[PDB]
UniProtKB/Swiss-Prot annotation:
Gene name per UniProt: BAZ2B
Residues of the full protein shown: 2054 to 2166 of 2168
UniProt function note: Regulatory subunit of the ATP-dependent BRF-1 and BRF-5 ISWI chromatin remodeling complexes, which form ordered nucleosome arrays on chromatin and facilitate access to DNA during DNA-templated processes such as DNA replication, transcription, and repair. Both complexes regulate the spacing of nucleosomes along the chromatin and have the ability to slide mononucleosomes to the center of a DNA template. The BRF-1 ISWI chromatin remodeling complex has a lower ATP hydrolysis rate than the BRF-5 ISWI chromatin remodeling complex.
Species classification: Eukaryota, Metazoa, Chordata, Craniata, Vertebrata
Family to which this protein belongs: Belongs to the WAL family.
Tissue distribution: Expressed at varying levels in several tissues, whereas a smaller transcript was expressed specifically in testis.
Name recorded for this polypeptide: Bromodomain adjacent to zinc finger domain protein 2B
Disulfide cysteine pairs (residue numbers): none
Oligomer and partners: Component of the BRF-1 ISWI chromatin remodeling complex, at least composed of SMARCA1 and BAZ2B, which regulates the spacing of histone octamers on the DNA template to facilitate access to DNA. Within the BRF-1 ISWI chromatin remodeling complex interacts with SMARCA1; the interaction is direct. Component of the BRF-5 ISWI chromatin remodeling complex, at least composed of SMARCA5/SNF2H and BAZ2B, which regulates the spacing of histone octamers on the DNA template to facilitate access to DNA.
Subcellular location(s) per record: Nucleus
Segments forming domain Bromo: 9-113
Amino acid sequence: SMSVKKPKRDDSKDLALCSMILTEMETHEDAWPFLLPVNLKLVPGYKKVIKKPMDFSTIREKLSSGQYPNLETFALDVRLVFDNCETFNEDDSDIGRAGHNMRKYFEKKWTDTFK
């Protein structure tokens, strides 16, 4: 509350560390569905169904331009990529499998870097 604060967690390295995580997600062999925005002209249904499209290149640009206020808003966009994927793709598809794999990979790196 006013003039009553928990001890200050050091957040000075968060930007660099989210960047490192994102590099690792970018270079994963199963990243290919997620590297670029879904082409809304070429994929029927996407535009109407997926209300907030998100992809790795868009997160990279937001990260690089100070559009994440804190590490939680960064994680929300990463998870949005996977939540979008599960909304549009069958589990038993190459893309559906990719999304599950990448979500796992991310959640581990997230816990190990920060929790």
